[PDB]
Design a protein around this ligand. Structure first.
Ligand SMILES: [Mg+2]
Ligand SMILES: [Zn+2]
Ligand SMILES: [Zn+2]
Lengths: 80, 108, 545, 141, 63, 24, 287, 59, 117, 112
RNA sequence: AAAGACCAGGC
């Protein structure tokens, strides 16, 4: 989808990880494997790192319009 | 409550660990010691000839624990150099004690 | 959920993002967890070891101060590895909300790394901080994701780093630079602290001594693997410090260039790992040497003091009885006394301890040493001071009265003595008026920044970068700006993104230098705050001032 | 087996000076084979004057028989290495840029742990040196 | 209140030396000579006796 | 200006709600 | 089959009870520092650890009295042979018990109208081996006026100076490097003798002196040197560089040992050597 | 600002609480040279010691 | 001496603020008085120009004025030292006291004249 | 050994040089006079006043330190406590009168 | 309860 940034912002990253960890705390099945981890936030971080997370976002423009998007389509890949 | 001074827990007094990146190299972790043992063991290992690295470190200055790292050549091994340093330190202390007892008996 | 107030102390040997918490605090604050799969055994271990304080299944809060089924709330006590967020009480501390990782100790204070003093603008002379403890899981995600130290590493007021090498670290680097070589024992002792391996010696064999490393090989022991970058005064290649040019006037900027090289190409935490390996190495380097200062450092010679007094009684005192009788536009006084102060600083930087304990290029910190070693300078004047002119005339008549031993041998507003040799009673009274005026200006005068920040936040609160990129108000939905930066677009990400509250960042970046200027209350920092008020506080109605 | 040797004579000390307190930089031409050189050297363990005689070698290994090199110089049974020299360094070649400006001169850049050295000269000698190769600075009077 | 048993810095026993120091002061000695004759060599030990304030006598009257 | 005379003038002249998550 | 051993040499210059001065050479500074650190913080003594107070009518409170009682030195020659109270199974603490505990008692009451001193000569042990150290009148504890009373019972145990400074046997143990002084006599002739007096008057202590019987200078007692740079900065201030030079003569030290009297000054050094052997033995590798 | 409490933290606090003098003013924060040393204080009031809060120079 | 005997012989005088404007006073120092006699009075000591917590500070004219203000107005009221000599009849809210209070090694003129510890 | 160690970055910035002059004076008056003259009145000419506005000059304080056997600059050589080596820098030492204030750490701990 | 009044620590 055009006209917006192909990067994910920090405010989307925070809410995606928050809702994913809240889902995992509610007995949801984990889309990846566990290398001996217990914290749900780190499981959600591994899910975001492996891009195995099902969600969709809607970026609202100021004029009323929006842009639908699927969460495995943004660049989250940036080291230093 | 002032009892956790020299007694360790169910751990070993000394624990050996042979690192993977460099060969002929190890790090001995000693519980309930500080600068006193670590400094003389370090300066006795430097007197050895098949020792290329010897160094000691407290992980935190408020902990009663040291870590001693030895890297040797291929003519010896870290455990031999450690034990040779300790035996040499005992024989030096015995020589010192005999000299001091002789001088004290001489002075009267 | 919970909050906590405590006195802070420092600790240089734990990590930058770590905070030490007293046990009396830690065993009475709880964290809440929802028990479910992947944590039945791990939480069962905790409740068996009596580390969970309380419980609620459903809603009826039964205490434990019971086996676990999936679906209730366990309240356990704070342990190692949790996340809190820290704030000194934000009187001026507008952006100091930091997220830190918890370890527990037995003392009564809160321990932080000394690199975190300038991000918090705190010191260890009695300051207290508030720690806050996030309970909800989405709040934990927001705190961990927006306010961590590696996330917040590059500043949003300036373009610089929030972490700078300060007092003891920079002094350790300077003394590591004035002698270049190190023997084997101390080099291997330092190499115990590095994250990398110690290299082969730069000098293998001289006929005089044994092998010897240089300090560049010691400084390279904190780099990550396969680093290769470049800046102004350095070349790093193959995770080796190939080149580092001479200086003490450049050294902090070269270290800042090395860290920005690492944080432009190295990782997710590698600049923090660089600091966490560098700082204890520098402490352990300086510790078997010591650093002190004696009376010899503070005693200017008889010759240089005679030159200072001769330059005063030649140049400064006949002029000051002329151009002070004119009005305010003649600040030639300040330039001429600054020339004499330059002469005094050139004299006093011959002592080896004094040039390492200050910043030489700084001028507010170099006037303070001239006041100690040489003359104090001008103390009384009747231009833009908070006292009147009748006080100045009374002090000039009193100067005629008390120095009955050859009155008018100088001026009444110039103090010729130093702090190290002691003031006269008249010079003490003249200095005490100037000190009292600075103290009153710093305490009573903190209401115009307080008003300015309120009126700045009242208008700049709701200005956001929008999803299409235009900087817009949100209560009126009007365009304030078409682009925030000049190279921001949807191919190149930048320092600022959509959703950023740029109005609050502008208001705080405007309020910080105002508070700093009034809290200093120097003449330069008074004139700057005047020049700032003459722009920020214009009036739409004509006042014909 | 070495890769270079030449007797050098210093032209001057300190082309700028004002640097670290126990380092001297020597700028030198060569006597026998046409070469240009300027180097950082320690002053207290090896004082060096103007108008000297010294020769320089560029071996990549100390051992006269064996090829590998791991470890410091703790002498003993295998002291049979090149001990013909009083001052040795160990560093890295980091820039082997080819000039073609006064093409008889071709420059080369090495660094011994922060101590720099530039060596110009003919293209017929700086070829077996290659980029990112460890080198030594065997040097005697 | 009373003289401390040991010097604060080094740990030398000084607690049996107060009345001797007062007796030497009463026979017209200087403070330096009264400390020289009593065996105190380090200045840390000398500042324990030069600076002690003997509050036990005032506490004994006011009950 | 950033005072009352400027503030009442404009007042007289005149993240949250940025995105939404849902299942897919 | 290798050996890399040292051979230290000891020469005692003055030895008495509670004092020892001796020079030690041909070892490293790490070994001298180990002996110093162990003598300060590792050699055990016996000191009062529990105080149980029955009557206190004095104008001092109980923590003041207990802290004063904790710091009185007792005679401790048994301390290497008895055991810590964390290790003794033959008792419960709480009384007299050999290998771990000594009981003391004290009782005093003023009946005259003069002020009664209560010293450390009023503490009576139930063991005639562990008594307070004899130095005078004894160490003052409290003073009473009339009708006041002190009555208590104490338990003295074994410990080390790393735990509390009341168990340390050393009022001060220190060493110093032995100096090596050279004076270049070919540059000493260049100075007139008032300039020589001006040079010698820069030294704080009495290391150099002037013998006008040959009109020269001489280094006499080169161990009063304190390694400040005063004479060297004076000769560098006159321009006459390199006239004198001082280097610390390596592997040679001078130890000074003072004890509180709980143990003798030779026994402190010998127990330091024994404890340092005992912790070198417990660190070994089994293999 | 007439009657104060006597402090007994040490005897010096009680000593200096009994030797104070005050210029009471209407709105604290707009005074003239009341907060400053005048040369007629010489020998009779201390020109070095004073509070630093609102009562700076007035006490 | 007594103070009354020195007043009754005219060696000392009590002087107010307005009369002191007609006075040439030597600065305390007898070396200012006796090197030149164009004076009518002389001070007893210059350090008596300061208050009781400021005159006892060593080298107090060698420090910056904000620091002397910090010491003599704030920090000396908060120090823990002597409290009282009859604590059995003092029911204060808080009372603190050192175990062994000491006096300084130096001797100012005010501390030699008041004779208080 | 010291009782209190303070940082040398506190002195060039706070403008309190008198703290160095008090410590150099106090050290001169608690030390024994070594009697290089060997006369009776070795402790007669001892300077101990430091009265404000009539302080002693620094030549008197340094001459008092020199008669006691110390360097005039006020610093002295010290050995490192953890390793035993002679430290390269000389250290300023001396007695200062310190005060323990009523603000204590265990009274500032609060939790809501 | 609520306000006055005081003091202290910061800004
Ligand atoms: Mg502060
Ligand atoms: Zn002592
Ligand atoms: Zn028992």
């Amino acid at each position: 989808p055009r006209k917006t940034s192909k990067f994910m912002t920090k405010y989307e990253r925070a809410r995606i990880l928050g809702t994913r960890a809240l889902q995992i705390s509610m007995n949801a099945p984990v889309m990846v494997e566990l290398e001996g981890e217990t914290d749900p936030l780190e499981i959600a971080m591994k899910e975001l790192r492996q891009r195995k997370i099902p969600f969709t976002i809607r970026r609202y423009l100021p004029d009323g319009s929006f842009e639908e998007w699927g969460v495995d389509e943004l660049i989250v890949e940036d080291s230093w | 409550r002032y009892e956790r001074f020299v007694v360790p827990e169910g751990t070993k007094k000394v624990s050996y660990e042979r690192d993977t990146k460099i060969i002929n190299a190890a790090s001995f972790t000693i519980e309930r010691e500080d600068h006193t043992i670590g400094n003389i063991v370090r300066m006795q290992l430097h007197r050895d000839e098949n020792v290329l690295f010897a160094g000691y470190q407290l992980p935190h200055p408020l902990k009663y624990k040291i870590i001693v790292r030895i890297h040797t050549t291929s003519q010896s091994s870290p455990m031999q150099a450690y034990n040779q340093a300790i035996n040499d330190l005992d024989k030096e202390l015995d020589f010192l004690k005999s000299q001091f007892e002789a001088e004290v008996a001489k002075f009267s | 959920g919970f909050s906590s107030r405590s006195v802070i102390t420092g600790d240089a040997f734990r990590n930058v993002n770590e905070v030490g918490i007293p046990m009396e605090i830690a065993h009475r604050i709880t964290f809440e967890e929802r028990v479910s799969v992947h944590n039945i055994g791990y939480l069962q271990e905790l409740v068996d070891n009596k580390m969970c304080l309380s419980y609620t299944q459903g809603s009826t809060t039964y205490s434990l101060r019971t086996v676990l089924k999936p679906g209730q709330i366990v309240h356990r006590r704070v342990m190692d590895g949790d996340v809190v967020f820290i704030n000194r009480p934000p009187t001026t501390h507008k952006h100091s909300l930091q997220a830190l990782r918890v370890y527990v100790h037995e003392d009564n204070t809160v321990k932080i790394n000394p690199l975190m003093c300038g991000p918090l603008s705190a010191d260890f002379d009695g300051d207290c901080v508030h720690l806050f403890y996030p309970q909800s899981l989405t709040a934990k995600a927001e705190v961990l994701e927006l306010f961590s130290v590696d996330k917040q590493l590059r500043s949003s007021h300036t373009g610089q780093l929030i972490l700078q090498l300060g007092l003891d670290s920079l002094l350790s680097l300077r003394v590591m630079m004035e002698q270049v070589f190190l023997d084997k024992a101390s080099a291997q002792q330092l190499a115990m602290y590095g994250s990398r391996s110690l290299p082969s010696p730069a000098v293998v064999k001289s006929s005089k001594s044994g092998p010897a490393w240089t300090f560049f090989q010691i400084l390279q022991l904190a780099f990550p693997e396969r680093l290769s970058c470049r800046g102004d005064g350095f070349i790093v290649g193959g995770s080796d410090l190939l080149s580092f040019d001479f200086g003490v006037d450049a050294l902090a900027s070269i270290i800042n260039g090395i860290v920005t090289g690492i944080m432009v190409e190295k990782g997710p935490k590698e600049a923090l790992a660089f600091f966490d390996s560098l700082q204890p190495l520098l402490m352990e380097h300086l510790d078997p040497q010591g650093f002190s200062l004696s009376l010899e450092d503070l005693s200017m010679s008889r010759e240089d003091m005679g030159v200072i007094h001769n330059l005063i009684v030649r140049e400064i005192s006949p002029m000051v009885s002329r151009l002070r009788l004119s009005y305010e536009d003649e600040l030639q006084l300040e330039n001429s006394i600054q020339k004499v102060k330059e002469v005094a600083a050139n004299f006093m930087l011959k002592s080896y301890s004094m040039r390492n304990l200050i910043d030489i290029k700084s001028n507010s910190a170099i006037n303070k040493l001239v006041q100690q070693i040489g003359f104090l300078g001008l103390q009384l004047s009747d231009k833009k001071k908070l006292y009147t002119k009748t006080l100045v005339e009374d002090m000039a008549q009193f100067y005629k009265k008390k120095y009955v031993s050859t009155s008018s041998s100088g001026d009444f507003g110039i103090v010729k003595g130093c702090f190290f040799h002691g003031l006269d009673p008249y010079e003490e009274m003249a200095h005490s008026v100037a000190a009292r005026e600075v103290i009153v200006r710093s305490s009573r005068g903190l209401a115009e920044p307080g008003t300015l920040f309120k009126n700045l936040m009242a208008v700049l609160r709701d200005i956001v970068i929008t999803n299409d990129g235009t900087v817009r108000n949100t209560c009126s939905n009007s365009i304030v700006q078409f682009k925030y930066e000049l190279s921001s677009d949807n191919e190149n990400q930048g320092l600022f993104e959509a959703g950023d509250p740029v109005g609050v960042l502008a208001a705080t970046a405007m309020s910080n230098p105002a508070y700093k200027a009034v809290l200093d209350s120097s003449p330069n920092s008074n004139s700057s705050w005047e020049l700032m008020k003459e722009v920020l506080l214009c009036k739409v109605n004509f006042q014909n001032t | 087996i070495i890769m270079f040797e030449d007797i050098f004579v210093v032209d001057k000390l300190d082309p700028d000076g004002k640097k670290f307190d126990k380092v001297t930089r020597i700028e030198a031409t060569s006597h026998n084979l046409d070469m240009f050189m300027h180097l950082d050297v320690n002053t207290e363990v090896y004082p060096m004057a103007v108008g000297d005689k010294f020769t320089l070698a560029m071996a990549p290994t100390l051992n006269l028989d064996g090829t590998p090199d791991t470890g410091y110089f703790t002498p003993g049974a295998k002291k049979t290495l090149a001990d013909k020299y009083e001052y040795v360094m160990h560093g890295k070649l980091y820039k082997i840029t080819e000039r073609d400006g006064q093409t008889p001169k071709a420059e080369m850049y090495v660094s011994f742990g922060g101590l720099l050295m530039l060596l110009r000269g003919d293209p017929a000698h700086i070829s077996h040196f290659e980029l990112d190769q460890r080198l030594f600075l065997l040097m005697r009077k | 209140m009373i003289i401390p048993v040991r010097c604060f810095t080094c740990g030398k026993v000084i607690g049996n030396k107060w009345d001797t120091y007062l007796d030497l002061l009463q026979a017209d000695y200087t403070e330096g000579d009264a400390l020289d004759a009593i065996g105190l060599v380090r200045y840390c030990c000398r500042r324990m006796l030069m600076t002690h304030v003997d509050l036990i006598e005032k506490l004994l009257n006011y009950n | 200006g950033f005072n009352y005379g400027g503030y009442k003038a404009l007042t007289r002249s005149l993240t949250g709600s940025q995105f939404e998550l849902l299942w897919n | 089959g290798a050996t890399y051993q040292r051979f230290p040499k000891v020469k005692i210059r003055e030895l008495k009870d509670d004092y020892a001065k001796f020079e030690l050479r041909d070892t490293d500074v790490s070994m001298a520092n180990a002996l110093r650190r162990v003598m300060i913080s590792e050699v055990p003594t016996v000191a009062i650890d529990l105080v149980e107070i029955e009557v206190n009518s004095s104008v001092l409170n109980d923590e003041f009295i207990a802290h004063r009682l904790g710091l009185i030195p007792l005679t401790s020659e048994r301390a290497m042979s008895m055991r810590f109270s964390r290790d003794c199974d033959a008792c419960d603490g709480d009384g007299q018990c050999e290998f771990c505990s000594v009981e003391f008692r004290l009782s005093a009451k003023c009946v005259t109208d003069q002020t009664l001193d209560v010293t450390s000569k009023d503490l009576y042990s139930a063991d005639p081996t562990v008594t307070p150290v004899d130095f005078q009148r004894g160490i003052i504890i409290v003073k009473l006026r009339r009708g006041q009373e002190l009555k208590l019972r104490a338990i003295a145990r074994k410990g080390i100076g790393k735990d509390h400074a009341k168990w340390s046997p050393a009022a001060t143990v220190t060493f110093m490097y032995e100096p090596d002084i050279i004076i270049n006599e070919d540059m000493m002739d260049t100075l007139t003798d008032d300039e020589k007096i001006d040079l010698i008057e820069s030294s704080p202590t009495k290391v150099f002196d002037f013998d006008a019987v040959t009109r020269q200078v001489v280094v006499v007692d080169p161990e009063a040197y304190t390694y400040d740079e005063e004479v060297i900065k004076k000769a560098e201030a006159m321009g006459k560089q390199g006239l004198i030079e001082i280097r610390p003569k390596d592997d040679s030290f001078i130890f000074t040992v003072e004890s509180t009297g709980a143990v003798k000054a030779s026994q402190l050094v010998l127990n330091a050597i024994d404890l340092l052997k005992q912790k070198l033995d417990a660190v070994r590798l089994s293999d | 600002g007439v009657v104060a409490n006597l402090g007994r933290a040490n005897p010096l606090q009680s000593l200096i609480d009994l030797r104070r003098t005050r210029q009471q003013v209407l709105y604290t924060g707009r005074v003239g040279d009341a907060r400053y040393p005048h040369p007629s204080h010489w020998g009779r009031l201390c020109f070095l010691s004073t509070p630093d809060g609102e009562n700076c120079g007035l006490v | 001496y007594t103070f009354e005997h020195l007043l009754d012989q005219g060696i000392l005088e009590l002087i107010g603020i307005e009369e002191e404007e007609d006075c040439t006073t030597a600065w305390g120092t007898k070396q200012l008085l006796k090197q030149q006699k164009s004076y009518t009075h002389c001070e007893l000591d210059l350090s008596f120009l300061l208050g009781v917590s400021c005159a006892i500070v060593p080298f107090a004219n060698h420090d910056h004025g904000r620091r002397v203000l910090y010491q003599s107005q704030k920090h000396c009221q908060q120090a823990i030292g002597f409290c009282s000599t009859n604590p059995n009849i003092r029911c204060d809210t808080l009372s603190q006291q050192l175990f062994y209070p000491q006096r300084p090694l130096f001797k100012t003129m005010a501390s030699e004249c008041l004779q208080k510890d | 050994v010291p009782d209190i160690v303070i940082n040398p970055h506190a002195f060039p910035s706070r403008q309190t040089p008198g703290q160095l002059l008090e410590a150099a004076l106090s050290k001169g008056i608690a030390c024994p006079m070594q009697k290089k003259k060997g006369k009776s009145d070795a402790y007669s000419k001892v300077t101990r006043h430091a009265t404000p506005f009539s302080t002693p000059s620094v030549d008197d304080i340094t001459d008092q330190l020199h008669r006691a056997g110390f360097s005039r600059s006020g610093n002295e050589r010290v050995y490192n406590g953890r390793t035993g080596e002679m430290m390269r820098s000389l250290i300023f030492m001396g007695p200062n009168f310190y005060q323990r204030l009523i603000h204590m750490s265990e009274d500032k701990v609060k939790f809501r």
